[PDB]
Paper text:
Class C Acinetobacter-derived cephalosporinases (ADCs) represent an important target for inhibition in the multidrug-resistant pathogen [name]. The class C Acinetobacter-derived cephalosporinases (ADCs) play a significant role in antibiotic resistance in [name]. β-Lactamase-mediated resistance to β-lactams can be overcome using combination therapy involving a β-lactamase inhibitor coupled with a partner β-lactam antibiotic. Many [name] variants have emerged, and characterization of their structural and functional differences is essential. X-ray crystal structures of [name] variants in this study provide a structural context for substrate profile differences and show that the inhibitor adopts a similar conformation in all [name] variants, despite small changes near their active sites.
Numbering used by the authors: 1 to 210, 219 to 360
Write the structure that this text describes.
Amino acid sequence: NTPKDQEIKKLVDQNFKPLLEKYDVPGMAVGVIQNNKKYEMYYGLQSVQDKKAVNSSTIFELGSVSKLFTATAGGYAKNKGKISFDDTPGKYWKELKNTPIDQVNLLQLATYTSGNLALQFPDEVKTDQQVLTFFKDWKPKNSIGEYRQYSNPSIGLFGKVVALSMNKPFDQVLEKTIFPALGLKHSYVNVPKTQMQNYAFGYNQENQPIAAPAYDVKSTLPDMLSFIHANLNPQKYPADIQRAINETHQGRYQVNTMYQALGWEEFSYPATLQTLLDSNSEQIVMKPNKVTAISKEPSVKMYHKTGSTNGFGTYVVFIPKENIGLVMLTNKRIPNEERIKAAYAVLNAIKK
């Protein structure tokens, strides 16, 4: 009585569209994949001054969602035998051997449990040598492996070690190995000149258009729906990338109701809304939390990740056994809680 594509479009309209007016967001792409059918919904403008509409070609910044590709790359290297998650970074970055950071293993870096790594690098750490200096000068604080503190330097060092183990710059790991293995055609660490007319302007909180170990990916909604498809259907992919994706799905420890996988955050499904919101609370995101072993290995589960830059917001979520996922991209930050709420409302109302 109402075709499925229209039902999903109506749900996105009801839950995501009001965010455009509420947060003065110029442009937004929302994608749903269900049962290997993709639905793409585009709103607004990728560049306000150019009156250029958001569309299937629009490139957005993923912010911390980029960590999902770092995690996938590490799962790939690990299953190609290039690294062990029990290895320390000094095995690959030789100038870190005999240093304090060489007590931390690669899994602990990937899952934010070094015990003394903040959310971001200091603002002055830009030179690739300044990164080496920062880790050479690093000293432990909390006991290694016991406290999760969400940290871009932490998984950044992990990505650096991954790239060294594959004898390539990290951006070439993604652009020449990981992105092609996932069938992504419009995903970049460095957006080529020929694609700059598709690169959305990011917009700051005044609606003004605005380091190499800062690993940051740009992508389109079709590519992110394809990435979600890969996470929903790892058996459809070659052995190496299949094992890579499964590696990112394994929960490693818990903080309350949240399971920390590689890059992905993992939850028992069905997940209460507040479980998903707790994962982005200041307590979880900004403060150290003691981690606990997994007790309940979730049989039925879901995964999500928020991401932001100064001018962009991202949310990705998927539920394997419901064969469904959703991506939201915007060229203006909106509160993480609003992304989670809107996606939760859509995913729970889509007819099964």
